[PDB]
Assembly symmetry: none
Homo-oligomer: 105 residues x 4
């Protein structure tokens, strides 16, 4: 009489359990998505890190090769200037002689 | 140990999946459980109802035979009273004829 | 982005943890389910054994009582014959003596 | 009443099984935390390098143009001092010819 009734409740609790493992199953699939995206993300991050260092190195090399070029320029000009100041001195001193010789005759 | 954290996370997730299948199996079995208990109750209630039936019968069949046999005792008593009376009748009658033979000579 | 996959993954895990607690509760209700049913079966099982005893007890009286009276019947039957016998004896004597009187 | 017993047994078993689920879920929770920890080690690292690069540009484009504003600043000196050579040369040749006269 109230044996059908207890069985019933019994079956209800079992049925709640079934539905519930149902959500469980799916949320597990999301947990799986999570780790898989994390793997994808870390992979990209590997990619990025070998490329980062490489990029830095490249930049450095470039800057360097384009610096020892520039300071070869700087000294070259210092020389030329050193020389043109020399010509200037040669010419000042020489001109005086010529003008003194001119007063003399 | 790069991917080893993603991995271990992934295995756990799978293990959960295997464990919850096992759950589904064991709930199916709990469900069998309740279905069958209802089966058995039905059976038991039948047994109960049948046992009482066959008690009632016994009581009726029983008190029926008693009355049939108490009846028959009755008639047999009467018949013995009739026969016994008849025996005492013929004893008296006898003695009276015996005497008429003695008082004859 | 990094933080999001963790965030979302972890939430999932927690939701499952959550939902297992619910399972345990309902399992306990199932357990209650069966213990109730067991009680009821115990009862029904006692009720049963009782009738199987009465029935037998009832058979044992019926059996016996009937036997009683059926014996009472037989002894009356014999007594009935004995008296029907003794009668015979006497109708015999009667006719015989009554003739002797007729003669004389 | 075999059904109770068996039913009861299955129930107990779900209970056992569900606790195993709980342990494995705790172990998944662990995964996600270990991973988050590394995404941090990792983001940090990357971040540090971008920063290291950018600072290299700030050394680079400041050094270069500190030394190119040294080029042209010597160049102007060259142009001007060698304008003085052309002055003095023409003027030497003038004077030389006033001599020979």
């Amino acid at each position: 009489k109230a044996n059908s009734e207890a069985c019933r409740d019994g079956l209800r609790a079992v049925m709640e359990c079934r539905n519930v493992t149902h959500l469980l199953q799916q949320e597990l699939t999301e947990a799986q998505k999570g780790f898989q995206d994390v793997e994808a993300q870390a992979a990209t991050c590997n990619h990025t890190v070998m490329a980062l260092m490489a990029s830095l190195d490249a930049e450095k090399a470039q800057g360097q090769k384009k610096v020892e070029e520039l300071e070869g320029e700087i000294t070259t000009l210092n020389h030329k200037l050193q020389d043109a100041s020399a010509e200037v001195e040669r010419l000042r001193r020489e001109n005086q002689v010529l003008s003194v010789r001119i007063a003399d005759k």
